[model samples]
Target chain A: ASIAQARKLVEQLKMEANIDRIKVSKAAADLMAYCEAHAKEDPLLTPVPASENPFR
Target chain B: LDQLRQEAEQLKNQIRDARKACADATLSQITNNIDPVGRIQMRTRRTLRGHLAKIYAMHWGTDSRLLVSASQDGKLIIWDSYTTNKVHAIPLRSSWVMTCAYAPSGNYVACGGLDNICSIYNLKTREGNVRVSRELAGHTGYLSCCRFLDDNQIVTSSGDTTCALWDIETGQQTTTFTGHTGDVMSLSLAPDTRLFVSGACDASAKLWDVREGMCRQTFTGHESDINAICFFPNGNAFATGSDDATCRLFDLRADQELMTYSHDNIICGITSVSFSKSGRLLLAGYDDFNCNVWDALKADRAGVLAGHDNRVSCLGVTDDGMAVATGSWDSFLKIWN
Candidate 1:
């Protein structure tokens, strides 16, 4: 539930995708899946839908 | 007959010149009223992460080359914006630092917290010493905000219902402004340094003369606590953000609220507000995790900078007006260029 963790994970994925130019390591893929699963719960890392204003 | 025709031709040319001049004047008026370039892109340029807790305050260094952020994690970070590198990390004594600011010269950084002390530090000093150059201690309650009035003076507001001015060199209190019945939440100094305005939990904002040490005017219109205050660029008016879910602008000469900025779908209170260099636009950070940009001249919302997942606790516009920096409870800071 941390923006820092999410950012760090995304950075790793981008590096492997650009520099390695091949399938990501299994560990990296698993981490990405984990992030997707937990992102909804982390308020800081989740994106607000355009129609929804969660202010109240 | 030829002479008469020549005079008629001359009259026609004069009419054409006048019509062109009128068109140019109208075009200039429209361009000046609306930003001809359209809304600037609000995409996040970079997200800075490292603090363990929510960021409470942020300020750009002189020239906008650096930025300083204070967080509830008891960390003060100086960032080299151009390179996106953290230049220094100065650990604070308390994790409750509510506000922090950099001096005009960028040589000093000051912050205040629940510890009821305002700590000033010299960014560069001896290696082993605590970097703190001076500590101003007198407040009986939590210090809400600290800002530099000049290179040698700093002002602080507190829950004690008072704001104090201190001399940086001697760490001595020069003036204590007492008028608010509730906690003083925010303060904004006029560009000319002749006056400053403070907003309080009592739902009132007061204008005080810095030289005379007296309250000049009291502005009352907000329904709830006032959280932020910012002076207009020309120093003729000031804006206040309130927990009542609105931002109000007040003029100094008229002693009345000039305008209130609000939206129907947005029910969140505003945490901070800032003005563009020309005072033509306003950037308001909201508790709903969005920052709304308004066309101050037209009283319309120009755009919204939305990305933060949590509340936008603080915001600042660079001196050059080229970018905006927002700090959020999401534990990350985003720069919009």
Candidate 2:
């Protein structure tokens, strides 16, 4: 779930498609990657520090 | 032995497809449960009038106060938005300037158009008149969009169906990324500068790795050409404005669309888009002469601001979240808050 890790897996599957099946392996890989990325702490998911403008 | 191996492969594939089904359902669930935003109470506050013709592109400085606009009038004018005063006006090599960008450091500006060359102008050095400090020439087609990195580099998309990265110091193209089959219409850089997303006339959006100079992912769902794109405030996602008369949001984690903004009354295409500092609001300039605001998470039309007599060609939101700005074919740039 780490943003960095999610990015890594995206690049991985992007290359793996050349050597493996697109529907089967890539789909399974995406599920596992999402579980990891969703659990990873996204910094912006917290209260954004500079968001208290009047425009909101 | 061969028969047993074939059976095992089939089971493995079955398991993978089942996992994909789970991913799709769970990802669908993640989009809901959001706090619905209130309607936007915004109005035009300042109108900067200098461009005698159409204003093609406008961008705010990092401070969100100063701005620069490239025009069909053959002039690039810098402005202080708060005062509605002109700071500097530089003549362009070509009158058909299509795009312009202010460097992150606010010390330089870049523009390109029918000339097929991206020109960099220095803000620090100006005598009685201003001139192009350096020109980046390589694309065989007209430059459609340009953006500055932290400060030292630029990325330009072209009608040549390719995009080029430039080193501002040496005025040389550091790299060229080629994959789109049609004109590259728009580009949006990630906050960290490692990646960028491009929308093109090929009816696809591509995630490109800046370091590797290759396309990482190709997103296709738009029925027409994508005209504009903007990164979300957090860099976790981005939004696309398309000629299909709709806007779609894509998340990086799932590599899929999370939300779409469209309505029955909205019939014209979107020309530009931006996200608020909090990423909760999305503003889009439309060919119908209106700037529509949407709840980014909910995909609901929260508000609409209309004033331009002609199509709103380009739009941007300030980094400080204080205001939004738009340039139009009516030859004026307006600030809204």
Candidate 3:
């Protein structure tokens, strides 16, 4: 959903702007894609209590 | 509720398209290369000392002649950048202060950390001493970063996986941005006060609207925790520093990354980042005790600022773009030009 929006936005901008010079590597692209899939929801698989945050 | 959510979604898409429409029309106008970037001949000009422990953050006041720093020493010291005098030493209510900010008005400052409260102080003091006048305490997790919207408002990112906009006078939260799954480490507000961005421990940064408490977009490219973020001088883009030992420039209009700044020899994590007033230079502070300056357009290392005895934890570029103040774990902050 949001990732789809990001993809549309990125591709549309790249096309409309005619910017072919910029290059992002495979690792960077994969990270962006993964963020779209997994970053929206809280990965609360295991939560660390605030008290245990070490700095706290 | 469903209709409102859909309407808001449409509005976001509309905005995304509108921004692309105006800026994407001209390729040469916003080209990475414009005017030639200046020489990066920055050297240690003055080493300011007051903190007994590691300094966590340094923020320049709008005048750029004044600055403020938070440290493990349990105090916030405002400094005169040129004279190297302590303007005021404000006691930190929370000694675990991780971040501090100088209000644009220059009459107030804020600091927060492990205590989960942001304390504001009135700098109108006698003999350079002041105390907390107000506190913003709503976050369940420790605060990571904060920035002033004006004299009346501020925005904060926290370890609790959220960002908040607070009304300074009422000390009440106006908006709550709960999108990230990890600790929000840093944030940078655009020139326009309504929009800001937050980077988190999840290795992603989210574009946000202060008025609506909504996430406009999420950008991810870093392979490690994002430690610092800064908006470009033009507000058309932003830069992020990460523990992955790289800094990246992300364009707002395109919603994509433009370039990555990294080198094989410099493998240390970047702790903080800022851009010169011209948007031509990207300055980053690293754990290796050096500040790396990169040409914003060419993705080339323009120069290196080497002087800090310990890890460079934070940095603040003067609005005039002539000097920069860097704080470190060495218990000293040095101004460079």
Candidate 4:
């Protein structure tokens, strides 16, 4: 929930995908909830979608 | 001639309908790009990892390598030109650092927070000495913004319903101009006009006498709080973004609202309203998760940039005019094409 932590994470992807910060925030709750539901697995193993490419 | 006229009318109607469809396409494109369920599933499935926060304010340094952002988490983070890693971070003890600006030399940076205070920090000093060198104090409430007027002077505005000038060299407040009835959320200094314009919750833009240190006039019309204001680089006029979901251009000579640019969302947290180096285009950031470009004089929105999850708080254009840097309340710094 700390925005500063989120800022650091987004910065890492600035070059890789050019994702928007607002779009990323909308997924935080779902990502965290999934992590809670799957505590037995390593969090790093879960890959988040890069962006919503609704153009298609 | 009558037949030609009828054809022209038919063409106009077709174009109008086309415009409507285009707008719908754009809106849906936005909804698709920000699909949380798919994104979260990817995160949970180990497709990608990292976090995103709300970007409160942003600015590009004299050198493109330094794109700066402040956030609601009471932190300021700097990104390298490539966005590989955070180069620096400054922590604060307040609600959040709302805005940040690079000094004239780009060696120093200034930030103001929800606590009604502006802090100056030395970005060059890597020893983590990034603290406020001089606190520009005057307004009685939260100081929402700060920017350098000159190397020796800086301007800041606050929720205290006032705007003030500070002398950084002397560490003294030169003047405080009062007139707004609500929080003074944004400020822009136009030395060419010897003026400073502030937008506030009271729904007005107050013109200040930089020399006299007083409010000379107030422009009222917006239906809600003014969240963003910036002067044209040449000082011909100033532009304001409001929570009412409109951006208005105010001319100095006529002292009137010249034109209005309408958009979606509350229109809050505009970091900087900048004209392209040619002065033909203007750009704005807002809660719409977009940094937009407009025809400066015609009031035409040239483009709507998509990305950023939360409110787009700040925007900066690089010197080359090729790229635009934007920070959002959702804690992301993005470069828009």
Global Cα lDDT for candidate 1: 0.72
Which model is ahead, 2 or 4, in terms of TM-score? 2
lDDT of 1 by residue, B205-282 (tens): 887877788566666778889988887766766778998788887665444454577778878899998876656667
CA lDDT, every prediction? 0.72, 0.74, 0.73, 0.59
Query: Per model, how much of the real contact set is kept?
Result: 0.00, 0.03, 0.01, 0.00
After aligning candidate 1 to the native by TM-score, how far in Å is the CA of B149 from where it should be? 2.0
Looking at model 2, residue A37 earns an lDDT score of: 47
Tens digit of per-residue lDDT, candidate 3, span B177-286: 87687899988988877788888898878888777666666666678889888986666577899988988877654555556788899888999998766655677889
Q: Alpha carbon lDDT of residue A5, candidate 2?
A: 48
Per residue, candidate 4 scores C-alpha lDDT tens digits across B52-153 of 456667676766566666777776766665534667766766646777887767778788877777777776655755656777655567777777776667
Worst 10 residues of 1 chain B by lDDT: B22-31
Most DockQ-accurate candidate: 2
Each candidate structure's TM-score, on Cα atoms with residue i matched to residue i, is: 0.75, 0.81, 0.77, 0.65
Each model's TM-score for chain A is 0.38, 0.30, 0.32, 0.27
For all the models shown, what interface RMSD does each have?
Answer: 29.9, 12.5, 18.0, 25.7
- Clash statistics: count for each candidate: 0, 2, 0, 28
**Candidate 3, which segments miss by more than 4 Å at Cα?**
A1-56, B1-39, B125-129
User: In model 2, what lDDT does residue B283 have?
Assistant: 81
